[model samples]
Target: KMYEVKKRKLEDYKSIIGEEEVSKIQEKAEKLKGRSFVHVNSTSFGGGVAEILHSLVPLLRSIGIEARWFVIEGPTEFFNVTKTFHNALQGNESLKLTEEMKELYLNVNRENSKFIDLSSFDYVLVHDPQPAALIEFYEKKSPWLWRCHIDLSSPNREFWEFLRRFVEKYDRYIFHLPEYVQPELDRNKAVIMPPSIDPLSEKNVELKQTEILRILERFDVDPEKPIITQVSRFDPWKGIFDVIEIYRKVKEKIPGVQLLLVGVMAHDDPEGWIYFEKTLRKIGEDYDVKVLTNLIGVHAREVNAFQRASDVILQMSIREGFGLTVTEAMWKGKPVIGRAVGGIKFQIVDGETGFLVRDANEAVEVVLYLLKHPEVSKEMGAKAKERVRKNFIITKHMERYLDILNSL
Candidate 1:
């Protein structure tokens, strides 16, 4: 089934980024006016890909392109196998997929490909490994681009070779960072298109101090205490446990400090609940530590308030696929401490916009330093917001995507 694309006008972004930037985007989009574009992915919500499309498709159509989004249909077993591919692609070594798993993975894509009229669009963009194999079933009536939003810096060799068979045939491939590009892939066909955040979205909107404090109080967090927040899914790769360790270190020195780990469960990822439960157990009996899930349908506003209420934001991911949380927090003008991995490396300028840490000790040190020097942190936060405005906002991302389409 087709995903519903929201209708948004370019004028809506005027207050967020000003009219000049929006006009530039509209001008770039004019080149591809009336061209048909389709974007396919595993889900329509609960992840950055869906979040981007929700804002992107409408903006594309608003600029005169006939843009549409489609979500692949698959069973639990299919997603389970694709999850293995996802983990393996991110260098998760303990997971292995048998031949039967591989067949099921391809079979599901084969079935899903029959539903889409690929020739109806001038350009087709398939996202991530979940639907990477769909191109093999298409007749190549339109240029197909595989947009991979994962960290492939040290992928499992065997799994990379397996997925390479399906992805290498695409007309072009897109990665979040240059370092993520596989060495064996053709350099000419590879494009670097980093992900972005919507400045006007509920998750990043400007909030008054009262609203921020009210939301924090509603969540039962003490506003008087210094809040260190990490907004991400409760996955191992996100380093949820590392955040806890760093929090413990920070709390010992500043006893009033609080740690808030906030995230939503995505439908495509079955491992979320498993990790969520483990995280809850790890945070047991620690009243200062709060693990809030987006279970009550108020995720975006809650996250926006949490980030705004936070004195510092931590994205200590072991491996990350763009880590849009960093951009989100930075957009809200909050100083962030993120691990040097994936797209996060590009977002943080290592002591300029934010601090990049290597381990829990370093994260704790940075967090403590930021807490001790509020003025310095505020300056960094301002720079972070400006950096996001110029680089990581949705307008820039949409312009780059249009550029790729125009080139094709």
Candidate 2:
């Protein structure tokens, strides 16, 4: 059975994006207000795909679109194959596969094609590399848009060549970065849709000072001390080691400074545990460094508190897939000192909203500069908030999605 997940109203966002934008969206949604949409992805939790669909589907429903979410459940071999498939597309050839991998993946999709039952929706939206083959197996009934969240800057030709056959079948293909689009794909069929953060969600909403302090203390964090945070999964691409080195350099200048690494270990990627443990090993014997996760009461509201409690935020991604954490912190109205990698490169306005640095040395210098000049940090944070309101919020993201649907 296809599981449907839900969440907020479109009118709830009017106060955030403003009356003009709100009315514009309402007018657009009115055109396709009664249209039906089915969004299918690998997981219903613990992923950017799920996060976006959580708010997006509900908001579409409010505007009168029957937006529904469906997750692809699977056998162990099927999940393993898709995991390797995703990494190869992300330029990691290390997760080697075999002819058996291809057989299992397609077989799973063939079975799910019938079980999930997508033949009735006006439109079908398939996410990530997991369900790309579903169109081949499922009975086609409407326009299907394939959205790939990975940065395809350096994808392996061998895997992409195989996947290209499946992707080309879709009426439209969507990616986070335009440069990441494959030259082989029809330029007209490919669309650039940067992922967005829902401002009113527990992860990005405004929190009271008292609630922030209580949550900080509950997580054993020092509410009074200056702090820097980087929230992401325990993946090597996130540059966790680099974040620790920058924290060490920052500590040399301000003893009261503390470091917080909010990390996650996903079950689908066992390789992630190595980095999770390595990150802990790197911060060894440093009491000032606090590493937290969902298992230890660090839920969405807690993350919201931490983002507001910290003086500065960082997202050092060696190879990022749009780095929504950068946008999340920015939405909280805090300056994000991000490494100019993948999506982070365009999300920041360099000196305007935040600093875009390349290495630990540059990141440390920027951190020092911001901390020393509180007034500058405050002003820059204000600019960052405005940037999010203007460009990175859910309304803009949904607007783009709607535009793509109509383009069909």
Candidate 3:
């Protein structure tokens, strides 16, 4: 069953942001008052798509626009095929799409479409590859947007062609970064709308220092130790293994530094558990390294505490689709060290808000530098929070959506 979207007042953001920014959002949303929107995706609780929609839908409704969210349910086989598509679209060529897998993918959508309806809405948004093919089965009277949140800069040729048939049917496309927009996509039809974090969300809200320390104590993390944290799923492309290597190198210079890897498994990602276990095996007998999965009840507040308690946050992905974890950390006024790939480049202004690195050595160098200089680290954290305030909050994202609606 789809979870009910919570209601939030726009005024709730007045203290965090300013009245002027909130007013702009309210004015823009006024233009969309009578409009209605429906967003479809794969999961409702686990991934960034779900997290964003959870807040986005409520914010939309609070501002007088009718908004609803739906998740497409499918079997393990369906997710397996979609996961392959996810990997292939992210430039992984090892996983080849099979005809049988294609049939399973279409069959799941074909069946789910009978139960879900998109006709009542003025605009319909289908997120990522999971429910992307829903457009093929249902006849949409309103404009439909295909929002691709993955790194599509260099997708596998054959798999992209397969997905392109379904994607090209949409009225507009949304990408996190301009580079992610495929060359074939019409420039006029494509929009660059980066993902954002809610400053008031449990994962990012302001927590007291006592609260943060208590949560760290509960997780057996030493509050006195300089902590390096990375919050992401246990996906291969996230480069959890590389993060461990970087941690080892950083530990050489900064002894007693603790590494915390926090993640949650999404319903649509079948490989999460396997990758998690592999990460655990890699951390064998290392007491300084801690891996916490959400299965053990590490929810958003716990993540919030971990980020707030940490000295430095790391998001070392080999390939990434706008590292939301990086944004979340930056929102908390923490200096982030992330890989120089995908939307991460757009989020972190190198040597300013945070440092961007290509490999483990560069990551180690930046991590050590930040750990050594507390004043410089504090300055970067302040800049990172300001960067998120200007560009990457939910209010800005809402304004962009309203702009899209107004343009139409």
lDDT accuracy of residue 99 in candidate 1:
93
Q: In candidate 1, how many Å is residue 379 off?
A: 1.5
* TM-score, every prediction: 0.86, 0.92, 0.86
**RMSD for each model, in Å, please?**
3.2, 2.3, 3.2
Off by over 4 Å in 1: 1-6, 92-107, 154-162, 208-211, 235-249, 266-284, 295-298, 358-365
Tens digits of per-residue lDDT for model 3, 59-95? 7888999888888888887887898898899889887
Can you write out model 2's per-residue Cα lDDT over 155-243, one digit (the tens) per residue?
87777877888899998888888767776778888888888888877788788888988898888899778899999888888878898
Candidate 2 has its poorest 10 consecutive residues by lDDT at: 1-10
Q: Candidate 2 lDDT (Cα, whole model)?
A: 0.83
Return the TM-score for candidate 1, rounded to 2 decimals.
0.86
1 or 2, greater by lDDT = 1
Error of 3 at 285 (Å): 3.2
Per-residue lDDT tens digits for candidate 1, residues 286-350, read: 98998888664448888888888899999988867777889998898888998888778879988
* Index of the highest-TM-score prediction: 2
lDDT of 2 at 151: 61
Q: Which clashing pairs does model 2 show?
A: none
What is candidate 2's TM-score against the reference? 0.92
